[PDB]
Symmetry: D3
């Protein structure tokens, strides 16, 4: 019979930048082992955050170039925002 089920993989990525401010952006190659059967959906959020109040809080994250074999874990702030630390979390399921 036909049933709908998912396989999920998940992970975190910690960036301890301070005493230096974090790079404006980061892109990390993540690999699924073994590859998924179907191209999975992937979402990303923040597990930890250390942002300076001297300017607005601007943070962004996403999963780019998602394939059955992996994806690019992306982060970026912009303009005058100063980020001191952060931890991205992500989950991918087909």
């Amino acid at each position: 019979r036909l049933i709908h089920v998912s396989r999920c993989e998940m992970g975190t990525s910690t960036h301890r930048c301070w005493p230096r401010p974090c790079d404006t952006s980061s892109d990390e190659p993540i690999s699924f082992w073994p590859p998924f059967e179907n191209t999975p959906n992937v979402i990303v959020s923040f597990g930890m955050l250390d942002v300076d109040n001297s300017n607005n809080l601007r943070v962004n994250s996403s999963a780019d170039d998602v394939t059955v074999g992996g994806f690019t874990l992306h982060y970026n702030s912009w303009y005058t925002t100063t980020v001191w630390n952060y931890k991205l979390i992500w989950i991918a399921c087909d």
Copy 2:
């Protein structure tokens, strides 16, 4: 034999407001197709955030009215907070 398995669905919703401030709240209908066999659990977070530092950071998100066919993706700030941009992320599994 009896085994525990999950089907998962996930998605994101971007709100680009600036030059205008984002509305105090938003409620968006999300449909699952096909419907889940069981009422899934759903959780919501933020994938992107642009908040003004001139006041406290107040953000809230939730999955309301969750059924096998979908749910209401909810967001709200409150009091004096000013939000310029945000992206919600959500995942539903049974």
Copy 3:
């Protein structure tokens, strides 16, 4: 045949502290019923957040002591950060 499937459990934990500031840290024991077959991965993020702008934003969360039977849902801010309210979200899949 051999296939990859996941079982997922998820939940949220709300802390309203206002007008008192939330404790610097929190640790909540979470149970998985029934226990997982394999030790799951767990990720944690924020569903709601209320942080004072008088100081930098510093929030941290994680799943600690993860077993098939459960885990410790952990939160903490640090230094001078003042947090007024927060809601943690978590998802665990094997």
Copy 4:
């Protein structure tokens, strides 16, 4: 994702007739608990057989009235055949 899986149930039914000849036919109600999600297919054969050589060997079996709740395990010989003992086997899968 969509996958093909089967749930299977199976069983045997022994008929010790000797010293009397087995009835020309038999029909036994079989129940699946719990019921299947989809009507299963069912096949039936012989695990044991004791047939007289004074006439031709004529045996027949089938799964009749198959529903998600169960089916009728059917057996019959015909004409001049004499059967002294027999055991039916069956398996149902969706």
Copy 5:
């Protein structure tokens, strides 16, 4: 997590030959739709049989050339055996 599951397909094939003896052998192509993910095992037996006592009972059956797409349902008697009617049953699982 990794788990062992099977998909099964099954079927029957009736050969009514009387008043003529059945052919010494038969080979029928069986198609699996959709094809299995992995090459399944297949076993074959007799659900009905009508054999003349004037000679020894000799019957044979098997699943030949098994692939994910199908196989050849084979039957044969040999030597002096005379078969009047028979029904084959088969089940394929991966």
Copy 6:
């Protein structure tokens, strides 16, 4: 969520004896690798059979001592029955 699925294993076992009569009984250790998670059901039938017509046809088969690790594939004729060749088939599903 909870679903019913089976894992199945199957196999055949050929005994060529002619021109000598096959033994009155046979018992073969069958191993499931890897073991099942739950004690499976097992049914056994005949895929090939060669019985002398000088006496009644008497054949018997079963799966004895079934565990998650394996079982004893049993066969026996009785009294004056002469069996020349036979092939057992079996399928085990949990």
